[PDB]
Design an enzyme around this catalytic site. Structure first.
Site, short mmCIF file in Angstrom:
data_model
loop_
_atom_site.label_atom_id
_atom_site.label_comp_id
_atom_site.label_asym_id
_atom_site.label_seq_id
_atom_site.Cartn_x
_atom_site.Cartn_y
_atom_site.Cartn_z
CG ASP A 493 -17.30 14.56 21.11
OD1 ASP A 493 -16.74 13.44 21.04
OD2 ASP A 493 -18.53 14.69 21.21
CD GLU A 717 -21.44 12.25 28.85
OE1 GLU A 717 -22.11 13.22 29.28
OE2 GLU A 717 -21.25 12.04 27.64
#
Ligand SMILES: *[C@@H]1O[C@H](CO)[C@@H](O[C@@H]2O[C@H](CO)[C@@H](O)[C@H](O)[C@H]2NC(C)=O)[C@H](O)[C@H]1NC(C)=O
Ligand code: 6A9
Length: 751
Positions: A493, A717
């Site tokens: 991202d 994560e």
């Protein structure tokens, strides 16, 4: 004309299906019809159907503070106060055992599936409520949701519920009286029930909260009575053909266990002692199968590391969902349009997320799944390949049905037909080729036109400014609020790329994914006898493997690494300007076309995807930057971005914290470990250094993931590069499950 191309973007690919005709029907796949296919719900089940039968659990602790009603538990919300929780056992097919820690309570949710009949068989649940190591009063809720015109026939006190559907035929649901844990002797419980039309799956929680409006008394024998909030005391239908919703409430003092049984008419007992015996037999069989598959004990892993592996696998299989619906699409040239309705059988990155499929995450999920159950992988890949439009595009985020949309405005749900995602679905294909299993080969033969259409779409739609160059479409539109435009389609991202986006950009990671994809598919084409496809894919793979072209397009001598190219300046900062707020300030020197200084995961791509020859003059330099503590080498694994970078720990906006700007990610660390294992085992001048780094990196990654799981009860994560602490979303099973393949030293090789 132009409108024909628009309809093409919104039409399913005409090639043959990779799955059999009615693949999900119980006549074809009886063992998979029922399952825990609702990952965003703590405990529930559904059928693999466009018109499914749904079940679920809710719970609430009584004796809560007044004016402030008890907290009702149903969905996996990350900030609801619950945790830790997760699957201890789940084989993705017959059974599962999960533990849920909730303040003063510990819940055990177990299930066993029993085949038989023509409609997908039977199932039984056992929910155990115990106090945390107090006799707290607890309410458990067991519901069923029908579809359309389907009705439920109660058996009154409420003994059972009978029903009928086209797909299930005749069936029965029974809530058995509670017992104490590990015993068959009945315990007294208080009963309440609500029955009406289905208000929609994202509205079940609020509907129950609204009907918990009147006080009752729990009156066990030989004890003082207790007051509790409940649903109506007696069964009465409340007043549209949108299906029915019937929820049963049971209340008593912990510790207790209660069984919820499903019985199929065609299959015509899985209760008490027989259910206890089934659970022990399944747990033992699982342990035996786990050792044979992964050989962790034989490979010298500790009992604690063995326990970590077992949880890594169980959480991943426990997060497999079934979705059905129409996604939103924006054709490439405009307003959003609906795509045709489609099914999706897939793993999910987090149970804490709205139930959705993610394209490049799935490739990593299936690397773990295929080692355990190859049939599950064929099912999941076959469903993702069913999502192709007539141009060969697959939306990177699959938001199918009401629960997945979860009250988000459509503007933020739309997938762009111009935008890609890494083709990681090809990574489990390499392993299937290597194993030469007939079922995998028969599947790949049928799937080949779809895999080929999808790959061709990627290198054609993302063509760069010059030959053999590629550029990710979809970098953010330059805004005064953004420090560096993100590249969401790449998967990384906020990894820094050129400050001033343009069509002159050249992206390194994308070129590497194309080179790997062409190689994987040329190998498949040759094995299958796809002569014309092999004649196209073979020369493309060789032209991209070639070192001269890669050097000309991405070797940056002033940086001593491979890099992205574009109109860039390092002179960009976020500064507060009243009245504007925090904005980007471009200083001196002004931007110019050059290689981008951003040493991190992207820089390593020819090494990660094993594209460099063992004698390549660029292999040594990449190995050195990877091993350097000032750059990528942290005590907890490889950093996403160099600790010496000006973007290290830098937020992109006031609302966007650093994401791929320093933190340790398990998917890229897994690829680095596969690459080091490769270069450390083939002859070459860097074999010794690669073999050494492999052992050191493996030890650091395994240790930290194990320790954080011990401290928190979760797989995360991402991990801090400073203290190793788990960060971001959790549970993340999810590619963090790759820790099992790291412990087993199981890496797929495409050479
Ligand atoms: C690199 O980025 C700069 C900054 O935006 C570009 O400069 C702009 O160029 C356009 C077109 O000539 C002008 O309208 C703007 O006034 C320029 N902006 C500034 C702040 O100078 C530059 O053209 C880009 N270079 C390349 C090769 O794409
Ligand atoms: C409350 O539920 C919210 C659900 C929807 C969230 C949408 C945003 C997805 C973020 C997670 N994640 C960001 C990574 O940079 C990507 O590489 C990765 O593919 C992606 C999926 O794991």
């Amino acid at each position: 004309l132009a409108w024909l191309r628009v309809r093409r973007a919104l039409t399913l690919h005409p090639a043959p299906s990779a799955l059999p005709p009615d693949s999900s029907s119980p006549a074809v796949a009886p063992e998979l019809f029922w399952g825990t296919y609702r990952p965003h719900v703590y405990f529930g089940m559904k059928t693999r159907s466009p018109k499914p039968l749904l079940t679920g659990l809710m719970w609430a602790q009584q004796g809560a503070t007044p004016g402030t009603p008890p907290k009702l538990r149903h969905t996996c919300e990350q900030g609801d106060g619950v945790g830790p929780y997760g699957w201890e056992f789940h084989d993705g097919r017959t059974f599962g055992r999960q533990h849920i820690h909730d303040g003063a309570l510990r819940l055990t949710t177990e299930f066993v599936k029993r085949p038989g009949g023509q409609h997908g068989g039977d199932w039984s649940w056992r929910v155990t409520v115990e106090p945390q190591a107090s006799f707290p009063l607890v309410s458990l809720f067991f519901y069923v949701v029908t579809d359309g015109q389907e009705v439920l026939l109660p058996e009154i006190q409420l003994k059972s519920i009978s029903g009928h559907t086209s797909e299930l035929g005749d069936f029965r649901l029974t809530l058995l009286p509670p017992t104490s844990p590990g015993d068959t002797v009945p315990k007294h419980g208080s009963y309440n029930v609500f029955w009406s039309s289905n208000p929609g799956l994202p509205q079940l929680t609020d509907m129950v909260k609204s009907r918990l409006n009147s006080w009752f008394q729990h009156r066990p024998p030989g004890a003082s009575p207790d007051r509790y909030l409940g649903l109506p005391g007696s069964l009465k239908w409340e007043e549209s053909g949108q299906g029915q919703f019937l929820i049963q409430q049971v209340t008593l003092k912990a510790p207790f266990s209660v069984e919820f049984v499903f019985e199929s008419g065609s299959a015509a007992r899985l209760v008490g002692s027989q259910l206890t015996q089934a659970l022990e037999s399944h747990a033992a069989a699982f342990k035996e199968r786990f050792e044979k598959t992964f050989q962790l004990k034989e490979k010298g892993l500790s009992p604690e590391e063995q326990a970590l592996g077992q949880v890594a696998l169980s959480g991943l299989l426990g997060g497999i969902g079934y979705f059905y619906g129409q996604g939103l699409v924006l054709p490439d040239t405009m307003d959003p349009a609906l795509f045709p309705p489609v099914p999706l059988f897939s793993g999910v990155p987090s149970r804490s997320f709205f139930p959705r499929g993610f394209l490049w995450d799935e490739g990593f999920h299936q690397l773990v799944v295929q080692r355990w159950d190859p049939h599950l992988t064929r099912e999941a890949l076959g469903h993702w390949l069913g999502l192709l439009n007539a141009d060969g595009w697959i939306g990177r985020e699959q938001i199918l049905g009401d629960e997945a949309r979860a009250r988000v405005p459509p503007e933020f749900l739309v997938q762009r037909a111009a935008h890609a995602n890494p083709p990681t679905l090809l990574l489990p294909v390499v392993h299937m080729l290597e194993g030469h299993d007939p079922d995998d080969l028969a599947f790949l033969r049928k799937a080949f036109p779809r895999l080929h259409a999808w790959f061709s779409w990627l290198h054609q739609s993302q063509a760069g400014p010059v030959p053999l160059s590629y550029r990710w479409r979809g970098r953010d539109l330059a805004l005064p609020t953004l420090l560096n435009p993100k590249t969401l389609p790449s998967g990384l991202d906020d990894y820094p790329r050129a400050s001033h986006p343009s069509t002159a950009e050249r992206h390194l990671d994308l070129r590497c994914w194309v080179a790997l994809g062409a190689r994987v598919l040329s190998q498949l084409a040759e094995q299958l006898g796809e002569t014309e496809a092999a004649a196209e894919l073979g020369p493309l793979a060789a032209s991209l493997e070639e070192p001269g072209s890669l050097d000309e397009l991405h070797w940056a001598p002033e940086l001593g690494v491979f890099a992205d190219f574009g109109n860039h300046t390092k002179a960009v900062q976020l500064k507060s300007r009243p009245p504007q707020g925090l904005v980007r300030v471009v200083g001196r020197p002004p931007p110019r076309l050059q290689y981008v200084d951003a040493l991190g995961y992207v820089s390593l791509f020819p090494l990660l995807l094993q594209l460099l020859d063992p004698s390549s003059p660029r292999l040594g330099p990449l190995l050195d930057v990877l091993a350097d503590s000032r750059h990528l080498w942290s005590p907890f694994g490889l950093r996403s971005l160099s600790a010496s970078s000006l973007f290290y720990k830098q937020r992109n906006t006031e609302h966007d914290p650093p994401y791929w700007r320093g933190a340790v990610w398990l998917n890229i660390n897994y690829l680095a470990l596969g690459a080091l294992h490769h270069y450390g085992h083939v002859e070459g001048p860097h074999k010794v250094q690669a073999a050494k780094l492999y052992h050191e990196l493996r030890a650091n990654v395994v240790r930290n993931v194990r320790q954080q799981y011990q401290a928190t009860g979760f797989l995360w994560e991402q991990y801090s590069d400073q203290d190793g602490r788990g960060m971001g979303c959790r549970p993340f099973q999810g590619w963090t499950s790759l820790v099992l393949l790291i412990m087993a030293e199981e890496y797929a090789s495409w050479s």
